[PDB]
């Protein structure tokens, strides 16, 4: 019933991917400390 056009929208194509990787990376940095 739904459409796949919205599933492959812009927010999933770049912002969600980058935000998730960026958050994970910064957390990794904090964990390492130095």
């Amino acid at each position: 019933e739904e459409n796949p056009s919205l599933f492959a929208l812009e927010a999933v194509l770049i912002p969600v991917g980058t935000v998730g990787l960026i958050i994970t990376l910064i957390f990794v940095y904090f964990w390492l400390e130095r």
Binding site: E10, I14, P15, T18, I22, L25
Partner: protein, 31 residues
Amino acid sequence: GGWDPVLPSVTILSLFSVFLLVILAHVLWKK
């Protein structure tokens, strides 16, 4: 005065994408 063009939403989203991309590349580069 004479109908000034206005930037679209796609361009703004694109800008945010590039900026966040720079953050990812910066953290990996500095790691």
